[PDB]
Design a protein around this ligand. Structure first.
Ligand SMILES: [Mn+2]
Ligand SMILES: [Mn+2]
Ligand SMILES: [Mn+2]
Ligand SMILES: [Mn+2]
Length: 224
DNA sequence: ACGCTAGGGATAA
DNA sequence: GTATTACCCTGTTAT
DNA sequence: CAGGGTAATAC
DNA sequence: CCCTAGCGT
């Protein structure tokens, strides 16, 4: 039998590796529900071969979140993360962390929910049928945020920065959240692209939904 | 003075 | 030589 | 967030 | 995602 131990160094196309993968069949219901959220948020899910198999690319600033995600995809990630030191068009140094799963036929069940055009997409009823509270957490940790950023703000209102999507797509996400969790929310706008504003009248309900799953280094994102 | 938005910047995707 | 593919790399901007 | 490129096995 | 200049109490 094969352990990640003995494959995590071998060349990409190596037979031992490819046999490693053939043991894994699907994604445990944690890795799956988290990925609905990670993909709504900050994760790249890509297919270099026409959808026969997808992988997941990661990039974040927060080495703790990065480390935590990797520990959740323990089986699917082979290497600890590659610190990326980049220089932007203003001579400024930016420090991110990067990583990736290997491709596997198991990541399609995720992919086919979003990727159509070869472009990330939201289908109707996605939230009803798959989004769960654990999903909602990683969505928040990735793209979520304050409405009111002035300190001394007693405001408890939350925004989910969905500017990647079409207004029609984001509208469907909203109907879902509204029906399925009973959150008082609704779409606003920012740079002419949609965001989901959750009214503070439900930061009770939204918080108790995502507090079970929220990692510590990501607590600086909430209100107070 | 001080709570609130919407406009907009420099990353953190 | 072709096929393959995880790790990196940069392009680029909506977050 | 999204694509490109290559070095490392396998044939 | 986050900050902040400006209107409105
Ligand atoms: Mn996003
Ligand atoms: Mn994020
Ligand atoms: Mn994001
Ligand atoms: Mn983006």
């Amino acid at each position: 039998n094969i352990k990640k131990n003995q494959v995590m160094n071998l060349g990409p196309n190596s037979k031992l590796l490819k046999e490693y993968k053939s043991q894994l069949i699907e994604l445990n219901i944690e890795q799956f529900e988290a990925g609905i959220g990670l993909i709504l948020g900050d994760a790249y899910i890509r297919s270099r071969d026409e959808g026969k198999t997808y992988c997941m690319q990661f990039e974040w600033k927060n080495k703790a979140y990065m480390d935590h995600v990797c520990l959740l995809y323990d089986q699917w990630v082979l290497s600890p993360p590659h610190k990326k030191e980049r220089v932007n068009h203003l001579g400024n140094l930016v420090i991110t962390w990067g990583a990736q799963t290997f491709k596997h036929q198991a990541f399609n069940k995720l992919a086919n929910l979003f990727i159509v055009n070869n472009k990330k997409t939201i289908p109707n009823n996605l939230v009803e049928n798959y989004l769960t509270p654990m999903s909602l957490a990683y969505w928040f940790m990735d793209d979520g945020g304050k409405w009111d950023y002035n300190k001394n703000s007693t405001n408890k209102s939350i925004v989910l920065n969905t500017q990647s999507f079409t207004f029609e797509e984001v509208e469907y996400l909203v109907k879902g959240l509204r029906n399925k969790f009973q959150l008082n929310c609704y779409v606003k706008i920012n740079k002419n692209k949609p965001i989901i504003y959750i009214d503070s009248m439900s930061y009770l309900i939204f918080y108790n939904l995502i507090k079970p799953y929220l990692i510590p280094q990501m607590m600086y994102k909430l209100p107070n």
